[PDB]
Amino acid sequence: IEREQHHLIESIEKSTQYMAKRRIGALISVARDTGMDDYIETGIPLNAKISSQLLINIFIPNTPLHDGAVIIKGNEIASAASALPLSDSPFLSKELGTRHRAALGISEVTDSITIVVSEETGGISLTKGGELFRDVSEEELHKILLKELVTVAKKPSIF
Amino acid sequence: GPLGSYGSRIEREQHHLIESIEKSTQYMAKRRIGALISVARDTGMDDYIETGIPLNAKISSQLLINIFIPNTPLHDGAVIIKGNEIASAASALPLSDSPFLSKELGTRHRAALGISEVTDSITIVVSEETGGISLTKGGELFRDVSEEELHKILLKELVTVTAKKPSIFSKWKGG
Ligand SMILES: OC[C@H]1O[C@@](CO)(O[C@H]2O[C@H](CO)[C@@H](O)[C@H](O)[C@H]2O)[C@@H](O)[C@@H]1O
Ligand SMILES: [Cl-]
Ligand SMILES: [Cl-]
Ligand SMILES: [Cl-]
Numbered sequence: 119i120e121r122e123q124h125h126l127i128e129s130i131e132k133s134t135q136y137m138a139k140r141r142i143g144a145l146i147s148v149a150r151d152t153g154m155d156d157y158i159e160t161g162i163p164l165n166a167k168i169s170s171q172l173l174i175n176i177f178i179p180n181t182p183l184h185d186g187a188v189i190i191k192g193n194e195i196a197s198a199a200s201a202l203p204l205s206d207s208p209f210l211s212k213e214l215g216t217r218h219r220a221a222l223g224i225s226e227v228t229d230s231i232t233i234v235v236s237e238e239t240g241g242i243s244l245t246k247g248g249e250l251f252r253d254v255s256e257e258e259l260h261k262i263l264l265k266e267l268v269t270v271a272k273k274p275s276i277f
Numbered sequence: 278g279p280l281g282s283y284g285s286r287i288e289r290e291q292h293h294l295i296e297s298i299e300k301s302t303q304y305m306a307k308r309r310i311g312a313l314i315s316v317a318r319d320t321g322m323d324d325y326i327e328t329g330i331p332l333n334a335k336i337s338s339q340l341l342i343n344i345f346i347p348n349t350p351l352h353d354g355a356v357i358i359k360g361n362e363i364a365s366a367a368s369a370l371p372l373s374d375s376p377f378l379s380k381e382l383g384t385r386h387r388a389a390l391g392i393s394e395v396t397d398s399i400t401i402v403v404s405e406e407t408g409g410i411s412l413t414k415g416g417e418l419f420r421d422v423s424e425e426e427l428h429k430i431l432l433k434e435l436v437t438v439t440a441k442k443p444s445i446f447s448k449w450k451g452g
């Protein structure tokens with residue numbers, strides 16, 4: 119369903135834009151082909167409609183839902199305050215803490231796309247397949263989410 | 278099921294709803310966080326659901342608390358609970374015109390009273406001024422109730438009494 123996927127992307131972009139300006143730390147993992155059921159069950163179940171508003175309310179500091187991962191599965195916010203594994207990568211910059219290391223860790227054992235907001239700088243990062251793309255612009259964020267979450271790769275790969 | 282193995286599914290969902298309300302209101306009350314939670318019963322509240330932001334979410338004390346954090350997108354209005362979901366947040370409810378409602382009470386109390394006049398909803402209010410917990414039902418206000426009185430009214434009004442042995446067997450619902 120192309121329509122739900124474009125809404126998902128917009129919801130991620132607007133919520134992370136708001137948190138970034140406020141240096142609110144956040145972690146959103148979007149499940150793809152590999153199952154994330156065991157990580158979903160570690161958290162508080164929501165099974166909620168996706169909206170930028172609900173994503174922002176989830177991550178407000180010192181609230182019951184903020185301390186852990188949001189996992190998006192199908193067309194729902196499946197859970198909040200979920201556990202994710204921590205990467206032991208030594209290549210990760212020293213100013214990045216356990217949130218970035220959790221995002222990297224999940225990307226190492228799933229094909230999920232994970233978006234991170236830094237509580238120190240408000241920079242936005244992405245992880246995929248054991249790798250981190252640090253401090254992306256608004257345009258780069260949009261381009262990678264469109265490519266990785268909207269199925270309609272139809273054109274020749276070179277482009 | 279997910280909730281537990283005792284009694285019927287409906288019973289467990291209703292006891293979880295009650296506990297979710299009690300825990301969330303206790304947390305908000307000590308922080309003087311304003312809150313307004315309306316539980317639909319036999320009366321449709323679909324039109325008020327449509328005024329809010331849709332959530333269609335599993336009920337938890339945690340989600341109720343996060344919804345009402347001040348100065349957030351979801352806090353400004355009513356949560357409406359319908360079936361076994363948090364249907365919407367930041368919904369508009371009608372205001373009561375009653376002059377019998379104390380002027381010391383704010384817009385949340387007047388919205389809670391207003392909905393209770395045209396539905397058989399149970400509505401819970403946390404006052405941002407006093408931290409008191411209030412309840413409305415059928416045009417009446419129960420003001421600044423104790424934890425014990427809150428539990429007693431929620432049990433009576435929100436838990437369907439069901440037969441004992443019949444409750445342990447799950448019925449087929451097409452799945
Ligand atoms: O607990 C409130 C919740 O229960 C439901 C059924 O899931 O309502 C049923 O039980 C109520 C209280 O015992 C009754 O008022 C009602 O008539 C009955 O449908 C939900 O509709 C309600 O939100
Ligand atoms: Cl469409
Ligand atoms: Cl951080
Ligand atoms: Cl950064």
Ligand SMILES: [Cl-]
Pocket residue numbers: 278279280281286289
């Ligand atoms: Cl259950």
Ligand SMILES: [Cl-]
Pocket residue numbers: 303304307
């Ligand atoms: Cl508390």
Ligand SMILES: [Cl-]
Pocket residue numbers: 311383384385386403404405406
């Ligand atoms: Cl108030």
Ligand SMILES: [Cl-]
Pocket residue numbers: 422423424425
């Ligand atoms: Cl008390």
Ligand SMILES: [Cl-]
Pocket residue numbers: 423424425426
């Ligand atoms: Cl008491």
